[PDB]
Write an enzyme that holds these catalytic residues in place. Structure first.
Site, PDB file in Angstrom:
ATOM      1  N   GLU A  60      -7.657  10.429   3.359  1.00  0.00           N
ATOM      2  CA  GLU A  60      -7.719   9.330   4.310  1.00  0.00           C
ATOM      3  C   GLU A  60      -7.805   9.924   5.676  1.00  0.00           C
ATOM      4  O   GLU A  60      -7.288  11.037   5.900  1.00  0.00           O
ATOM      5  CB  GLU A  60      -6.450   8.465   4.202  1.00  0.00           C
ATOM      6  CG  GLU A  60      -6.222   7.601   5.452  1.00  0.00           C
ATOM      7  CD  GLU A  60      -5.171   6.509   5.308  1.00  0.00           C
ATOM      8  OE1 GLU A  60      -4.882   6.097   4.198  1.00  0.00           O
ATOM      9  OE2 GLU A  60      -4.606   6.089   6.339  1.00  0.00           O
ATOM     10  N   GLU A  68       0.912  -1.162   0.000  1.00  0.00           N
ATOM     11  CA  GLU A  68       0.000   0.000   0.000  1.00  0.00           C
ATOM     12  C   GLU A  68       0.942   1.200   0.000  1.00  0.00           C
ATOM     13  O   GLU A  68       1.859   1.237   0.836  1.00  0.00           O
ATOM     14  CB  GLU A  68      -0.811  -0.018   1.325  1.00  0.00           C
ATOM     15  CG  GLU A  68      -1.925   0.994   1.431  1.00  0.00           C
ATOM     16  CD  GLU A  68      -2.443   1.130   2.808  1.00  0.00           C
ATOM     17  OE1 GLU A  68      -1.621   1.316   3.713  1.00  0.00           O
ATOM     18  OE2 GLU A  68      -3.701   1.066   3.029  1.00  0.00           O
TER      19      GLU A  68
HETATM   20  C1  LIG Z   1      -4.282   1.564   4.176  1.00  0.00           C
HETATM   21  O1  LIG Z   1      -5.513   2.313   3.977  1.00  0.00           O
HETATM   22  C2  LIG Z   1      -6.693   1.692   4.593  1.00  0.00           C
HETATM   23  C3  LIG Z   1      -6.722   0.161   4.397  1.00  0.00           C
HETATM   24  O2  LIG Z   1      -6.810  -0.199   3.012  1.00  0.00           O
HETATM   25  C4  LIG Z   1      -8.112  -0.687   2.648  1.00  0.00           C
HETATM   26  O3  LIG Z   1      -8.159  -2.069   2.821  1.00  0.00           O
HETATM   27  C5  LIG Z   1      -9.441  -2.635   2.567  1.00  0.00           C
HETATM   28  C6  LIG Z   1      -9.632  -2.520   1.053  1.00  0.00           C
HETATM   29  O4  LIG Z   1     -10.913  -3.032   0.739  1.00  0.00           O
HETATM   30  C7  LIG Z   1      -9.599  -1.036   0.634  1.00  0.00           C
HETATM   31  O5  LIG Z   1      -9.602  -1.033  -0.792  1.00  0.00           O
HETATM   32  C8  LIG Z   1      -8.372  -0.285   1.198  1.00  0.00           C
HETATM   33  O6  LIG Z   1      -8.523   1.129   1.085  1.00  0.00           O
HETATM   34  C9  LIG Z   1      -5.447  -0.496   4.891  1.00  0.00           C
HETATM   35  O7  LIG Z   1      -5.814  -1.393   5.931  1.00  0.00           O
HETATM   36  C10 LIG Z   1      -4.490   0.603   5.368  1.00  0.00           C
HETATM   37  F1  LIG Z   1      -3.289   0.069   5.697  1.00  0.00           F
END
Ligand SMILES: *[C@H]1OC[C@@H](O[C@@H]2OC[C@@H](O)[C@H](O)[C@H]2O)[C@H](O)[C@H]1F
Length: 185
Positions: free
Chosen positions: A172, A78
């Site tokens: 975010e 990520e």
């Molecule tokens: C980085 O941002 C939030 C989260 O990422 C999410 O994970 C679930 C997925 O469905 C989404 O597309 C993402 O935005 C991650 O846990 C964090 F580290």
């Protein structure tokens, strides 16, 4: 460029009122939230993409980031290019810095444990960051020449995956309230 992907994800905590606006535009108005990420961009990310945005409102009340955001697979990573933030400036293991688009950004790695990802609800994965050394002014057109960040990350052993998933210009937040409005192209 026209955007083709709308990101609107909340871990369910508090209120995240995200409005999928005209074209590349969106707003978020959030209240006492868990973690959430909202933004616009592209279903298939690229290390060679140029992302432009204009944040007409940047008013976090607490912890929020105004940030390029996306994923790769193989490996699962990520990643962020953070241009502005609220009360908390995100940091981690210092790798070095990169100049891009008139800013200088610190480069970090962190790890998340037992966290949501694109491939499951309890995942452990590396996060890669470029975080600007001072908040970028908002309300004028701005550009993130992402290849400059990718190359810098590479030059410190931060290698992205081969299988690119979505790539957005995001708001975010965690444990906070606030308002943003962002147009992406
Ligand atoms: C980085 O941002 C939030 C989260 O990422 C999410 O994970 C679930 C997925 O469905 C989404 O597309 C993402 O935005 C991650 O846990 C964090 F580290």
């Amino acid at each position: 460029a026209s955007t083709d992907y709308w990101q609107n994800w909340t871990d369910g905590g508090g209120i995240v009122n995200a409005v999928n606006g005209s074209g590349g535009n969106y707003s978020v108005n959030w209240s006492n939230t868990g973690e959430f990420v909202v933004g616009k961009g592209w279903t298939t990310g690229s290390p060679f993409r140029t992302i432009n945005y204009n944040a007409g409102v940047w008013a976090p009340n607490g912890n929020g980031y105004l940030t390029l955001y996306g994923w790769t697979r193989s490996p699962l990573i990520e990643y962020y290019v953070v241009d502005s933030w609220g009360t908390y400036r995100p940091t981690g293991t210092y790798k070095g810095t990169v100049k891009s688009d008139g800013g200088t950004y610190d480069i970090y790695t962190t790890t998340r444990y037992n966290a949501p990802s694109i491939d499951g609800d309890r995942t452990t994965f590396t996060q890669y960051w470029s975080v600007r050394q001072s908040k970028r002014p908002t309300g004028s057109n701005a550009t993130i020449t992402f290849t400059n960040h990718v190359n810098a990350w590479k030059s410190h052993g931060m290698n992205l995956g081969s299988n690119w998933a979505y790539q957005v210009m995001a708001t975010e937040g965690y444990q906070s309230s606030g308002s943003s409005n962002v147009t992406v192209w």
